[PDB]
Protein backbone atom coordinates (compact mmCIF):
# COMPACT_ATOMS: atom_id res chain seq x y z
CA UNK A 1 0.00 0.00 0.00
CA UNK A 2 1.72 3.16 -1.26
CA UNK A 3 -1.54 5.00 -1.99
CA UNK A 4 -0.80 7.49 0.80
CA UNK A 5 2.96 7.55 1.18
CA UNK A 6 3.33 11.30 1.58
CA UNK A 7 0.28 11.75 3.80
CA UNK A 8 1.60 8.87 5.93
CA UNK A 9 5.05 10.44 6.28
CA UNK A 10 3.51 13.71 7.36
CA UNK A 11 1.21 11.82 9.80
CA UNK A 12 4.12 10.20 11.63
CA UNK A 13 6.00 13.52 11.84
CA UNK A 14 3.02 15.20 13.49
CA UNK A 15 2.56 12.14 15.74
CA UNK A 16 6.15 12.37 16.99
CA UNK A 17 5.43 16.07 17.59
CA UNK A 18 2.32 15.65 19.75
CA UNK A 19 2.78 12.34 21.55
CA UNK A 20 3.50 12.47 25.28
CA UNK A 21 7.25 12.29 25.89
CA UNK A 22 8.76 9.58 28.01
CA UNK A 23 9.83 12.19 30.55
CA UNK A 24 6.32 13.59 30.96
CA UNK A 25 4.96 10.03 31.20
CA UNK A 26 7.50 9.33 33.95
CA UNK A 27 6.53 12.51 35.86
CA UNK A 28 2.85 11.53 35.68
CA UNK A 29 3.55 8.07 37.05
CA UNK A 30 5.64 9.58 39.86
CA UNK A 31 2.71 11.86 40.75
CA UNK A 32 0.41 8.85 40.92
CA UNK A 33 2.93 7.19 43.28
CA UNK A 34 2.91 10.32 45.45
CA UNK A 35 -0.90 10.45 45.37
CA UNK A 36 -1.29 6.77 46.21
CA UNK A 37 0.92 7.11 49.26
CA UNK A 38 -1.17 10.05 50.48
CA UNK A 39 -4.31 8.00 49.99
CA UNK A 40 -2.79 5.10 51.99
CA UNK A 41 -2.30 7.59 54.83
CA UNK A 42 -6.07 7.79 55.34
CA UNK A 43 -7.23 4.21 54.63
CA UNK A 44 -5.41 0.95 53.89
CA UNK A 45 -8.59 -0.24 52.20
CA UNK A 46 -8.63 2.38 49.43
CA UNK A 47 -6.80 2.05 46.10
CA UNK A 48 -5.74 4.70 43.58
CA UNK A 49 -6.02 3.59 39.96
CA UNK A 50 -5.15 5.46 36.76
CA UNK A 51 -7.45 5.20 33.74
CA UNK A 52 -7.99 7.18 30.54
CA UNK A 53 -5.38 8.02 27.89
CA UNK A 54 -2.34 7.96 30.19
CA UNK A 55 -3.14 4.37 31.16
CA UNK A 56 -4.00 3.07 27.67
CA UNK A 57 -1.12 4.83 25.89
CA UNK A 58 -3.31 7.24 23.94
CA UNK A 59 -2.11 10.42 25.60
CA UNK A 60 -1.20 13.70 23.96
CA UNK A 61 1.56 15.80 25.50
CA UNK A 62 0.55 18.23 28.27
CA UNK A 63 -2.44 16.05 29.10
CA UNK A 64 -4.33 15.65 32.39
CA UNK A 65 -4.43 12.46 34.47
CA UNK A 66 -7.60 10.55 35.12
CA UNK A 67 -7.47 8.91 38.54
CA UNK A 68 -9.90 6.73 40.43
CA UNK A 69 -10.16 5.89 44.14
CA UNK A 70 -11.52 2.37 44.66
CA UNK A 71 -13.04 0.74 47.73
CA UNK A 72 -17.11 9.39 52.76
CA UNK A 73 -13.35 9.15 52.22
CA UNK A 74 -13.33 11.73 49.42
CA UNK A 75 -13.55 14.66 51.84
CA UNK A 76 -10.74 13.23 54.02
CA UNK A 77 -8.57 12.57 51.00
CA UNK A 78 -9.26 16.05 49.69
CA UNK A 79 -8.18 17.63 52.97
CA UNK A 80 -4.94 15.63 53.11
CA UNK A 81 -4.08 16.62 49.53
CA UNK A 82 -4.38 20.31 50.39
CA UNK A 83 -2.47 19.84 53.65
CA UNK A 84 0.15 18.20 51.42
CA UNK A 85 0.54 21.39 49.39
CA UNK A 86 -1.70 20.42 46.49
CA UNK A 87 -4.24 22.87 45.10
CA UNK A 88 -7.66 21.77 43.95
CA UNK A 89 -11.43 21.88 44.17
CA UNK A 90 -14.14 19.52 45.44
CA UNK A 91 -17.86 19.74 46.20
CA UNK A 92 -18.92 17.40 49.01
CA UNK A 93 -22.28 15.65 48.68
CA UNK A 94 -22.11 15.90 44.86
CA UNK A 95 -23.85 13.09 42.95
CA UNK A 96 -20.51 12.19 41.31
CA UNK A 97 -17.82 13.20 43.83
CA UNK A 98 -14.77 14.67 42.11
CA UNK A 99 -11.47 16.07 43.33
CA UNK A 100 -9.80 18.29 40.76
CA UNK A 101 -6.16 19.09 41.44
CA UNK A 102 -5.10 22.18 39.50
CA UNK A 103 -1.69 22.82 40.98
CA UNK A 104 1.15 21.60 43.16
CA UNK A 105 3.15 23.98 45.34
CA UNK A 106 5.33 21.43 47.15
CA UNK A 107 5.50 18.02 45.46
CA UNK A 108 7.45 18.87 42.34
CA UNK A 109 4.78 18.40 39.66
CA UNK A 110 4.37 22.02 38.56
CA UNK A 111 1.92 24.91 38.84
CA UNK A 112 0.11 23.53 35.74
CA UNK A 113 -0.27 20.01 37.14
CA UNK A 114 -3.84 18.79 36.75
CA UNK A 115 -5.77 15.64 37.39
CA UNK A 116 -9.31 14.56 38.19
CA UNK A 117 -9.95 12.04 40.91
CA UNK A 118 -13.29 10.21 40.86
CA UNK A 119 -14.59 7.52 43.22
CA UNK A 120 -15.49 3.93 42.35
CA UNK A 121 -15.55 4.54 38.62
CA UNK A 122 -14.96 0.87 37.75
CA UNK A 123 -16.59 1.07 34.30
CA UNK A 124 -14.02 3.65 33.17
CA UNK A 125 -11.27 1.36 34.45
CA UNK A 126 -12.69 -1.49 32.33
CA UNK A 127 -13.26 0.49 29.13
CA UNK A 128 -9.65 1.63 29.59
CA UNK A 129 -8.58 -2.04 29.73
CA UNK A 130 -10.34 -2.58 26.40
CA UNK A 131 -8.66 0.45 24.76
CA UNK A 132 -5.22 -0.64 26.11
CA UNK A 133 -5.80 -4.08 24.63
CA UNK A 134 -6.55 -2.68 21.18
CA UNK A 135 -3.48 -0.39 21.23
CA UNK A 136 -1.52 -3.57 22.01
CA UNK A 137 -3.11 -5.43 19.09
CA UNK A 138 -2.10 -3.05 16.29
CA UNK A 139 0.68 -0.47 16.10
CA UNK A 140 -1.34 1.89 13.84
CA UNK A 141 -4.05 2.57 16.45
CA UNK A 142 -2.04 4.82 18.83
CA UNK A 143 -0.87 7.31 16.16
CA UNK A 144 -4.26 7.28 14.43
CA UNK A 145 -5.94 8.20 17.72
CA UNK A 146 -3.42 10.88 18.68
CA UNK A 147 -3.88 12.46 15.26
CA UNK A 148 -7.70 12.37 15.44
CA UNK A 149 -7.62 13.95 18.93
CA UNK A 150 -5.19 16.65 17.84
CA UNK A 151 -7.34 17.41 14.81
CA UNK A 152 -10.51 17.60 16.89
CA UNK A 153 -8.95 20.01 19.38
CA UNK A 154 -7.56 22.23 16.63
CA UNK A 155 -10.93 22.29 14.91
CA UNK A 156 -12.78 23.22 18.13
CA UNK A 157 -14.97 20.10 18.09
CA UNK A 158 -13.47 18.53 21.21
CA UNK A 159 -15.66 20.40 23.71
CA UNK A 160 -18.26 18.21 25.49
CA UNK A 161 -19.19 21.10 27.79
CA UNK A 162 -19.84 23.33 24.82
CA UNK A 163 -21.86 21.16 22.47
CA UNK A 164 -19.26 18.91 20.83
CA UNK A 165 -17.57 15.58 21.64
CA UNK A 166 -15.24 14.11 24.27
CA UNK A 167 -11.84 12.66 23.30
CA UNK A 168 -13.22 9.33 24.47
CA UNK A 169 -16.02 9.75 21.93
CA UNK A 170 -13.47 10.20 19.18
CA UNK A 171 -11.52 7.10 20.29
CA UNK A 172 -14.73 5.08 20.02
CA UNK A 173 -15.51 6.41 16.49
CA UNK A 174 -12.00 5.38 15.53
CA UNK A 175 -12.30 1.87 17.00
CA UNK A 176 -15.70 1.40 15.45
CA UNK A 177 -14.32 2.29 12.00
CA UNK A 178 -11.30 -0.02 12.45
CA UNK A 179 -13.56 -2.90 13.50
CA UNK A 180 -16.81 -2.70 11.58
CA UNK A 181 -16.32 -0.37 8.59
CA UNK A 182 -12.93 -0.90 6.98
CA UNK A 183 -12.50 -4.04 4.86
CA UNK A 184 -10.68 -6.04 5.75
CA UNK A 185 -11.06 -5.08 9.45
CA UNK A 186 -7.88 -4.02 11.20
CA UNK A 187 -9.36 -5.41 14.42
CA UNK A 188 -11.75 -8.15 15.50
CA UNK A 189 -14.52 -7.14 17.89
CA UNK A 190 -13.18 -8.39 21.23
CA UNK A 191 -16.61 -8.19 22.93
CA UNK A 192 -18.33 -10.41 20.35
CA UNK A 193 -15.55 -12.99 20.24
CA UNK A 194 -16.80 -16.57 20.70
CA UNK A 195 -14.07 -16.81 23.37
CA UNK A 196 -15.42 -13.83 25.34
CA UNK A 197 -16.57 -14.65 28.90
CA UNK A 198 -19.19 -12.52 30.62
CA UNK A 199 -18.03 -10.41 33.56
CA UNK A 200 -20.48 -8.25 35.48
CA UNK A 201 -19.41 -5.05 37.21
CA UNK A 202 -21.90 -2.47 38.52
CA UNK A 203 -24.64 -4.08 36.46
CA UNK A 204 -22.92 -4.19 33.06
CA UNK A 205 -21.00 -6.82 31.13
CA UNK A 206 -17.40 -5.67 30.81
CA UNK A 207 -16.18 -9.06 29.62
CA UNK A 208 -14.06 -9.26 26.47
CA UNK A 209 -11.60 -11.58 24.72
CA UNK A 210 -8.43 -10.33 26.42
CA UNK A 211 -6.04 -13.12 25.42
CA UNK A 212 -4.04 -10.94 23.03
CA UNK A 213 -1.29 -13.40 22.10
CA UNK A 214 -3.96 -15.72 20.67
CA UNK A 215 -5.23 -12.98 18.39
CA UNK A 216 -3.79 -13.32 14.86
CA UNK A 217 -2.07 -10.36 13.12
CA UNK A 218 -4.31 -7.94 11.23
CA UNK A 219 -5.25 -8.97 7.70
CA UNK A 220 -5.43 -5.24 6.87
CA UNK A 221 -2.09 -3.88 5.66
CA UNK A 222 -3.17 -0.30 4.94
CA UNK A 223 -0.83 2.54 5.85
CA UNK A 224 -1.64 4.99 8.64
CA UNK A 225 -2.38 7.67 6.00
CA UNK A 226 -4.88 5.33 4.29
CA UNK A 227 -6.67 4.46 7.55
CA UNK A 228 -7.04 8.11 8.45
CA UNK A 229 -8.36 9.05 5.02
CA UNK A 230 -10.90 6.23 5.17
CA UNK A 231 -11.99 7.33 8.65
CA UNK A 232 -12.58 10.96 7.67
CA UNK A 233 -14.48 9.80 4.58
CA UNK A 234 -16.70 7.41 6.50
CA UNK A 235 -17.87 10.06 8.93
CA UNK A 236 -18.12 12.80 6.27
CA UNK A 237 -20.22 10.89 3.77
CA UNK A 238 -21.33 7.39 4.74
CA UNK A 239 -22.29 7.29 8.40
CA UNK A 240 -25.82 8.58 9.07
CA UNK A 241 -25.91 10.22 12.52
CA UNK A 242 -29.65 10.93 12.33
CA UNK A 243 -30.55 7.26 12.18
CA UNK A 244 -27.59 5.15 13.29
CA UNK A 245 -25.71 4.26 16.46
CA UNK A 246 -22.01 3.68 16.71
CA UNK A 247 -22.01 0.35 18.51
CA UNK A 248 -19.73 -2.49 19.55
CA UNK A 249 -22.55 -4.99 20.25
CA UNK A 250 -23.57 -5.91 16.71
CA UNK A 251 -21.62 -8.41 14.56
CA UNK A 252 -22.21 -6.21 11.51
CA UNK A 253 -22.04 -2.95 13.46
CA UNK A 254 -25.59 -2.12 12.38
CA UNK A 255 -27.75 -0.33 14.96
CA UNK A 256 -30.71 1.99 14.52
CA UNK A 257 -31.57 4.78 16.96
CA UNK A 258 -35.11 3.36 17.20
CA UNK A 259 -34.14 -0.22 18.15
CA UNK A 260 -31.98 1.37 20.82
CA UNK A 261 -34.85 3.60 21.91
CA UNK A 262 -32.43 6.51 21.66
CA UNK A 263 -34.88 8.79 19.85
CA UNK A 264 -35.47 11.71 22.22
CA UNK A 265 -29.72 13.80 24.17
CA UNK A 266 -29.03 11.61 21.12
CA UNK A 267 -28.10 13.90 18.19
CA UNK A 268 -24.89 11.85 17.84
CA UNK A 269 -25.32 8.31 19.28
CA UNK A 270 -22.24 6.43 20.42
CA UNK A 271 -23.19 3.47 22.59
CA UNK A 272 -20.46 2.82 25.16
CA UNK A 273 -19.21 -0.77 24.65
CA UNK A 274 -19.79 -1.61 28.33
CA UNK A 275 -22.15 1.02 29.76
CA UNK A 276 -24.75 0.30 27.09
CA UNK A 277 -27.26 2.83 28.43
CA UNK A 278 -24.74 5.63 28.23
CA UNK A 279 -24.58 7.67 25.01
CA UNK A 280 -21.00 8.94 24.95
CA UNK A 281 -22.20 11.56 22.46
CA UNK A 282 -24.89 12.83 24.86
CA UNK A 283 -23.12 16.22 24.79
CA UNK A 284 -23.35 16.79 21.03
CA UNK A 285 -25.83 19.48 20.06
CA UNK A 286 -27.52 20.11 16.73
CA UNK A 287 -25.02 22.84 15.93
CA UNK A 288 -22.04 20.93 17.31
CA UNK A 289 -22.94 18.00 15.07
CA UNK A 290 -23.20 20.28 12.04
CA UNK A 291 -19.76 21.65 12.81
CA UNK A 292 -18.34 18.15 13.46
CA UNK A 293 -19.68 16.87 10.11
CA UNK A 294 -18.40 20.01 8.40
CA UNK A 295 -14.89 19.24 9.64
CA UNK A 296 -15.11 15.58 8.55
CA UNK A 297 -16.08 16.74 5.05
CA UNK A 298 -13.29 19.38 4.81
CA UNK A 299 -10.71 16.79 5.93
CA UNK A 300 -12.04 14.34 3.36
CA UNK A 301 -11.83 16.99 0.63
CA UNK A 302 -8.31 17.97 1.59
CA UNK A 303 -7.13 14.37 1.21
CA UNK A 304 -9.07 13.67 -1.96
CA UNK A 305 -7.41 16.65 -3.63
CA UNK A 306 -6.28 16.34 -7.23
CA UNK A 307 -3.31 18.72 -7.07
CA UNK A 308 0.14 18.24 -5.57
CA UNK A 309 1.64 18.62 -3.26
CA UNK A 310 -1.25 18.62 -0.80
CA UNK A 311 -1.04 21.18 2.05
CA UNK A 312 -1.53 18.54 4.74
CA UNK A 313 -0.69 21.11 7.44
CA UNK A 314 -4.13 22.74 7.14
CA UNK A 315 -5.56 19.50 8.56
CA UNK A 316 -4.34 20.64 12.00
CA UNK A 317 -4.61 24.43 11.61
CA UNK A 318 -6.86 26.42 13.95
CA UNK A 319 -10.57 26.89 13.40
O1 LIG B 1 -18.35 9.21 28.39
C2 LIG B 1 -17.19 8.84 28.98
C3 LIG B 1 -16.10 9.71 28.98
C4 LIG B 1 -14.92 9.28 29.57
N5 LIG B 1 -14.84 8.05 30.12
C6 LIG B 1 -13.56 7.64 30.71
O7 LIG B 1 -12.82 8.81 30.88
C8 LIG B 1 -11.57 8.62 30.31
C9 LIG B 1 -11.04 9.90 29.78
O10 LIG B 1 -11.91 10.65 28.99
P11 LIG B 1 -11.29 11.64 27.91
O12 LIG B 1 -12.34 12.10 26.95
O13 LIG B 1 -10.74 12.77 28.58
O14 LIG B 1 -10.27 10.73 27.17
P15 LIG B 1 -8.77 11.06 26.84
O16 LIG B 1 -7.88 10.78 28.01
O17 LIG B 1 -8.30 10.11 25.74
O18 LIG B 1 -8.80 12.59 26.37
P19 LIG B 1 -7.62 13.63 26.51
O20 LIG B 1 -7.33 13.98 27.96
O21 LIG B 1 -6.37 13.04 25.90
O22 LIG B 1 -8.07 14.96 25.78
C23 LIG B 1 -11.89 7.67 29.20
O24 LIG B 1 -10.70 7.11 28.59
C25 LIG B 1 -12.76 6.76 29.81
O26 LIG B 1 -12.10 5.78 30.54
C27 LIG B 1 -15.91 7.25 30.09
O28 LIG B 1 -15.84 6.14 30.57
N29 LIG B 1 -17.07 7.63 29.53
MG1 LIG C 1 -8.58 13.22 29.64
MG1 LIG D 1 -16.09 8.82 33.24
MG1 LIG E 1 -17.55 6.59 1.05
MG1 LIG F 1 -9.19 20.47 7.34
Nearest ligand, CA 145:
1
* Beta bridge partners of residue 256, listed in sequence order: 244
- Taking the centre of ligand 4 as the mean of its atom positions, its distance from the CA of residue 239, in whole angstroms, is 9
**Which are the contacts of 156, defined by CB distance < 8 A and separation ≥ 6?**
164, 291, 319
- State how far the Cα of 283 lies from the Cα of 163, in Å rounded to an integer: 6
Q: Which helix (H) or strand (E) holds 86?
A: strand 86-90
User: Exposed/middle/buried for 93, CB within 10 Å: 0-12, 13-18, 19+?
Assistant: exposed
Answer yes or no: do 94 and 180 share one domain.
no
Task: Say how far apart CA 74 and CA 55 lie, in whole Å.
Answer: 22
What pairing do the DSSP bridges indicate for beta strands 65-70 and 115-119? parallel
Pick the last residue of a domain from 91, 116, 137. Answer: 137
User: Which ligand number lies closest to the CA of residue 171?
Assistant: 1
Could you say which of 71, 104, 137 is where a domain stops?
137
Residues 155 and 299 in one domain: yes
Range of the domain at 122: 20-137
318 Cα to the center of ligand 4, angstroms: 26
How many H-runs (helices) and E-runs (strands) does the chain carry?
A: 9, 9
- 182 and 91, same structural domain? no
Question: Does residue 309 have a cis bond before it (omega within 30 degrees)?
Answer: yes
233 and 147 co-located in one domain: yes
192 and 62 within one domain = no
CA pair distance 166, 280, nearest whole angstrom: 8
Q: What 3-state class would DSSP assign to 106?
A: coil
Residue 124 φ/ψ, nearest 5 degrees: -65, -35
Instruction: Pick the last residue of a domain from 137, 170, 201.
Output: 137
Same domain, 162 and 86: no
Residues 190 and 210 sit within 8 Å (Cβ to Cβ): yes
Same domain, 170 and 268: yes
Clarify whether residues 226 and 312 are in a common domain.
yes
Q: What total number of domains does the chain contain?
A: 2
| Per-position b or e across 26-49, b if 16+ CB within 10 A of its CB | ebbeebbebbbebbeeeeeebebb
Query: Best substitution site from 18, 19, 24, 53 to test ligand 1's pocket, by max atoms within 8 Å of Cβ?
Result: 53
Q: How far is 238 from 232, CA to CA, in rounded Å? A: 10
**Residue 85: its H or E element:** none
* Residue 60 in contact with ligand 1 by CB distance below 6 A: yes
CATH number of the CATH domain containing 3: 1.10.1410.10
Going from the Cα of 118 to the center of ligand 3, the distance in angstroms, rounded, reads 8
Amino acid sequence: DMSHKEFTKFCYEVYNEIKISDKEFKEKRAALDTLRLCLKRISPDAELVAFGSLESGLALKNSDMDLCVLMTIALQFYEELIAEGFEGKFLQRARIPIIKLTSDTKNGFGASFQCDIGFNNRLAIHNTLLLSSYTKLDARLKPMVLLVKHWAKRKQINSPYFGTLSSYGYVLMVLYYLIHVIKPPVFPNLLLSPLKQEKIVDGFDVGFDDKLEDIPPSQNYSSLGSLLHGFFRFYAYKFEPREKVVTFRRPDGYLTKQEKGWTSRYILAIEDPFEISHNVGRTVSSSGLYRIRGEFMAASRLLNSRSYPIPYDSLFEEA
